[PDB]
Amino acid sequence: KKNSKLKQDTIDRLTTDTYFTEKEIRQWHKGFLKDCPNGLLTEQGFIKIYKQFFPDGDPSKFASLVFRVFDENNDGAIEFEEFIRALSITSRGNLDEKLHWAFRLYDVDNDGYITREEMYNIVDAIYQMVGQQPQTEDENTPQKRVDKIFDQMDKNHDDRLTLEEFREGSKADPRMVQALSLG
Numbered sequence: 117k118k119n120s121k122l123k124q125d126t127i128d129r130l131t132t133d134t135y136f137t138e139k140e141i142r143q144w145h146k147g148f149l150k151d152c153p154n155g156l157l158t159e160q161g162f163i164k165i166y167k168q169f170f171p172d173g174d175p176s177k178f179a180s181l182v183f184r185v186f187d188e189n190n191d192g193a194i195e196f197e198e199f200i201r202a203l204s205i206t207s208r209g210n211l212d213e214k215l216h217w218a219f220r221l222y223d224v225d226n227d228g229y230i231t232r233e234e235m236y237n238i239v240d241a242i243y244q245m246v247g248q249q250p251q252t253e254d255e256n257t258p259q260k261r262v263d264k265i266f267d268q269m270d271k272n273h274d275d276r277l278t279l280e281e282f283r284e285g286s287k288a289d290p291r292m293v294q295a296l297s298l299g
């Protein structure tokens with residue numbers, strides 16, 4: 117296809133932008149096409165991949181949130197180049213890069229701020245995936261513990277987190293990014 121072949125121009129950009137060698141990129145492409153012969157990974161295809169890893173819960177919500185960050189050009193598919201860029205950051209990136217990636221995940225509406233509600237959303241999604249837990253203390257729910265973490269990161273108390281607040285906030289309390297395995 118136009119999307120099934122790995123073109124040199126794609127490799128050039130990927131070796132410029134990522135932590136992968138040309139050899140690794142070519143190897144990854146073989147694996148990408150095995151899982152995705154069309155060269156394009158759909159949202160539901162992405163969800164199915166997560167269901168293989170968390171058969172107990174429902175990883176649908178979390179996978180959809182992650183999908184949007186992989187799909188950086190917002191055309192509704194993950195192409196190989198997008199897959200590799202995201203893999204590079206999340207598996208080989210430095211702390212600042214990983215934190216920025218996590219910020220993009222939490223900023224669901226891409227308005228440049230994380231709200232409490234956005235943070236609730238991701239946390240809920242994670243619990244749906246790995247297993248929800250009953251709380252008998254209304255003062256000690258996930259939302260309330262998140263509120264405390266949020267409040268501590270929200271340095272000017274405007275009820276929203278900038279990238280700088282989240283990134284610096286997470287270096288002192290890495291729990292929101294460790295929750296994505298990015299700390």
Ligand SMILES: O=C(CN1CCCCC1)NN1c2ccccc2Sc2ccccc21
Pocket residue numbers: 165166169182202203206296297298
């Ligand atoms: O590990 C990531 C990126 N994750 C890390 C933290 C959660 C949010 C971003 N990619 N990924 C991944 C990780 C876990 C489950 C499914 C996937 S699909 C996939 C297919 C081939 C190689 C890597 C990946």
Ligand SMILES: [Ca+2]
Pocket residue numbers: 186187188189190191192193194195198
């Ligand atoms: Ca895309």
Ligand SMILES: [Ca+2]
Pocket residue numbers: 222223224225226227228229230231234
């Ligand atoms: Ca937002």
Ligand SMILES: [Ca+2]
Pocket residue numbers: 270271272273274275276277278281
């Ligand atoms: Ca703020």
